[model samples]
Target: PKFFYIKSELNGKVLDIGGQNPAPGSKIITWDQKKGPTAVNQLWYTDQQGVIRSKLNDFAIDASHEQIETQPFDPNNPKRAWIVSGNTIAQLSDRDNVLGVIKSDKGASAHICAWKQHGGPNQKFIIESE
Candidate 1:
C-alpha cells in the first residue's frame, strides 16, 4: 500500500485530520504539512474498494452530507467510495460532486466540501507518495 499526501491545488494545503484527532467524524481539512509526528495525520491511501484511508488510525474519509470527514472504515458504506480523476477526488456514487476546498476557509482552517465538478483549482488535488 502506497501512502500519499492529497495536496489541494487551490491553496497548496494537504488533507488533514483536524487537530490530529482519531475520533470518528473528525473534520477533514486542508492544512500545510506539519514538520513532525503530527504530520502523519496528513497521510492517506486508497483501499481496493476506493475508500480513502487516513494514516491517522486508518479512518476512512467519508462523505457525510456535504462535509468531508473521517469515520471508521466501513466497506459496506457507499459514501466511502471515491475515485481520483484528473486532479479531482470524486464520489463514485456522485461523479458530478467532487471534493473541493472552501475558498474563505483556506489553509489550516479550510474545510472540505463536495461541489459539482467545475474544473476549478480548488477541486484539483495533486497526489504525492510519502
Candidate 2:
C-alpha cells in the first residue's frame, strides 16, 4: 500500500490533506510525482482507534468539472455522515436516506435512492489527523 503525508489548513494537522485551496467540491487526491494530482474527491483521518477514516460531507463536485464546492452538510442537522469499517467508509444521508461505500483502495459503490452507483477507485478517500 502506498500512502502520502498531507496537512489540513483547518486544524493544522499533519493527517489532513487536500484542503490546500479550501474550496468545497474540489477534488482532493494524493500528490503524484507523475500526474501531479489525481481526481479523487474525499478526505481521510486517523480515528481514536488509530484507524484511518474519511470525512465525506466536506465536499461536493460541480457540474462543470472545474470547481469543487466545500461546505458543511447541515450544521443543525448533519444528514451527510460517514462511518468507517475496516478500510472502507460509508457515506450516509439523513435527507435522502442513501448510503455510499468507499474503500481505501479507491473502489467506490453507492446505494442512492435504492440505486447502485460506482466510480473510479480514486473515489476512496483518506483523512489526515495530527
Candidate 3:
C-alpha cells in the first residue's frame, strides 16, 4: 500500500496522507491507508463533521514521504461522503457516520469503508477495470 496527501482548496485545509480531510487549521498527522487506518496525513478544510468545503489536493508521493500536489473538487454538499466504485457512486449520510463497504472484482476484490475520522484500512479503496 502507498500513502498520499489530499488538501482542501477552498479553506486551505490540509489532510494527512490517508485522505483524512480535516477541518480548517487543524494539525496534520500521518496515517496508513492499509494498516493504521486512523492516521490520515492529507490536509483539507471542512466542518467538524468532516464535510468537505473544498476540492481535494494530493500531496504524498509514497508511504514514507510528502510531496506537493493539488486538485479541485466540487463537493456541492458539505455534509456527505462520496464513494465511487466501479460504475456506481454513492453518497453517505452524516447520520450513518460509517460509509458502506464497497466490493469490486477485476481479478481481486477490494473492500472500502468510510467514517468521520481520518480513515482506516476499511476506508481505503481502489477502482479497477476489467
Candidate 4:
C-alpha cells in the first residue's frame, strides 16, 4: 500500500481535514506545517481508481456534486471519486457526464464547489509523499 499525504503545491500544507473527532462537517482544508500529532487527518489512501479515503474516519472525499456545504464522502459513490491530473484531483465522471471545480460561492471561502471544467487551480491538490 502506498501511504501518502494529500498535500498542497501552493503552500505545502498536507490536507488536514480534521481538527475534531470523527471529523465531518468541519473545515476540510488546513495547513499542517508541523507534520505532528500522529496526524490521522494528514494521511490518505487511494485504491480502486484513486478513491481517496480518510484514515481518520474511513470516509471517501466528497465533491458534493449536489451541495456546497457539508462536503461529504462515500466509499462507493463515484461522485466522491477522484483522479489525478498532474498533482491535482479531478472529479470522477462518466464519459457522457463530466464535472468541474470552481471557487465556492456558498459562504465564500477558499473551499471548492463543483462546476463545469473551469480550467483553474482553486480545486487542484498534490498528493505529497509521506
Candidate 5:
C-alpha cells in the first residue's frame, strides 16, 4: 500500500533494479546499494493485496513459481503477489507462510526469488527511507 526501497540487510544497500525504463529482461534485482531515495531505480510501490509494483518498470514483482531470480514486474498472473511483514517480502502462498524474498547466488547481478524462510542474511531486508 506504499512505496519503498528493498534494502538488503547484509550489504545495507537499497535494491537497484534499473537506471531508466529498463528493457524487459535487461535486469531484475542486483544487490548493489542505490545512493539516495530520489533514484527511480530504487523506488517501488505495493498495494493492499501485496502486489509489489515497480516504479522502474510499472510491473509487479514475480517469482515465476520457480527457484530463480526475480523477473521484471510482469503481473500477467497473481502468483506474483508478495506480502510485506515488517520489511520481509514474501511470496503469495496458500499457507500464508513467511517465504522470504531471496537474493540470487550469482553475485553482483543477483536477482530475487521467494523461498521457505531460512532465517539467514540473504533472506532479510529492511525498508529504505524515503
Candidate 6:
C-alpha cells in the first residue's frame, strides 16, 4: 500500500503525467518534482500483479508507441506490467526493453520512452517512498 516517486537517476526528475492530465493516452515524462495538488500525479505504486499503478487515478504504466504512458489498468495485460529491478524499470513482457529518459529534449522536461537496455543513467531510476 506504499506509494513512491519514480525518479530518474540521470536528472533527479520524477515521472510525471504530462500536463497533469489523467486521460488514458497521456504521455509519461520526467520533470522536476512538484509540490501542492499536482504532485500526486507523480506518485506510483506496484499492484499485486506488478502493475505500476498511478496514484493520481486508476491508470498504470504501459509501453506503447515506443514511449511510456499510463493507461487504464488491465491486470490481464502483461504490457502494462514492469520489473523494477535495481534502478531499471523493464517491461515484464520484454526484459530487454526498459524505461529510459530521452536524451535530446530541448525543453525543461524530458520524455520517457521504452528503449533496449543500455545501462545508461537515463535508464536508471530510484523509487522513493512518498
Clash number for model 3? 22
- TM-score for predicted model 1 compared with the true structure: 0.88
Instruction: State residue 10's C-alpha deviation in candidate 3, in Å.
Output: 33
Highest-scoring model, lDDT:
6
When 2 and 3 are scored with TM-score, the better candidate is 2
lDDT of 2: 0.32
Residue 13 Cα positional deviation in candidate 6, in Å, after optimal superposition: 0.4
Give Cα distance to truth, residue 90, candidate 4, Å.
Answer: 1.2
lDDT of 5 by residue, 1-130 (tens): 3567787776565666644445544345545555555577677787666667677666666555553223555445545666567656776653243434344565545555566677777777787645
> By the lDDT metric, which is better: model 3 or model 5?
5
Clashing pairs in 1: none
Tens-place lDDT per residue, model 2, 74-119, is 3233332444432233434322221222223444222111112243
lDDT of each: 0.82, 0.32, 0.31, 0.54, 0.59, 0.83
Question: Model 6, which residues run further than 4 Å from truth?
Answer: none
Q: Which stretches of candidate 1 lie over 4 Å from their true place?
A: 105-108
The CA lDDT at 102 in model 3 is: 32
- Model 1 C-alpha lDDT per residue in residues 1-130, reported as the tens digit of each score: 6888999998899998888888989888888876656689999888787667888788877887667898887667867777777788988877887888885533338888887888889899999888
For every model shown, the clashing-pair count is 0, 17, 22, 0, 4, 0
Q: Can you tell me which runs of candidate 3 are displaced by over 4 Å?
A: 1-93, 109-130
Model 6 over residues 1-130: C-alpha lDDT tens digits? 6888999999899999988897888888888898766688898888876668899886978876667788897767777777688889988878888888985457557888887888889899998888
- Give the C-alpha miss distance for residue 90 in model 5, angstroms: 0.5
Better of 1 and 6 by lDDT: 6
Q: In model 3, what lDDT does residue 35 have?
A: 25
**Which model scores highest in TM-score?**
6
**What is the TM-score of each predicted model, taking all chains together?**
0.88, 0.31, 0.24, 0.65, 0.69, 0.89
